[PDB]
Write a protein that binds this ligand. Structure first.
Ligand SMILES: C[As](C)(=O)[O-]
Length: 100
């Protein structure tokens, strides 16, 4: 695996709001990745991209509606990172997650 990996599980049913992810990295870096998940024996990916601001921060927002009903697990992945990048937190549905 060449990706930096962050597993998650979700409700199979609730699709309100956003899946919001906080990344911390090199200021002004450029970055991309996905929210990946298994759906009926396929690995599906919702791509994200963005740059860190001058504080090293990048907030990604993906509508929950992009994940099919019935999906209950997946992985946030970092693909390209021009400098350093890590996920610190995500919020999806009622789950407020901090990555120690
Ligand atoms: C509420 As937790 C253990 O996912 O940061």
């Amino acid at each position: 695996s060449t990706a930096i990996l962050y597993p998650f599980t979700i409700s199979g049913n609730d699709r309100n709001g956003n899946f919001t992810i906080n990344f911390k990295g090199t200021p002004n870096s450029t970055n991309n990745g996905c929210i990946g998940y298994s759906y009926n024996g396929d690995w599906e990916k919702i791509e994200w991209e963005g740059s860190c601001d001058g504080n090293g921060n990048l907030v990604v927002e993906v509508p929950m509606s992009k994940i099919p009903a019935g999906v209950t697990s997946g992985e946030i992945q970092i693909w390209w990172h021009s400098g350093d990048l890590k996920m610190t937190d995500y919020k999806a549905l009622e789950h407020h997650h901090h990555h120690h």
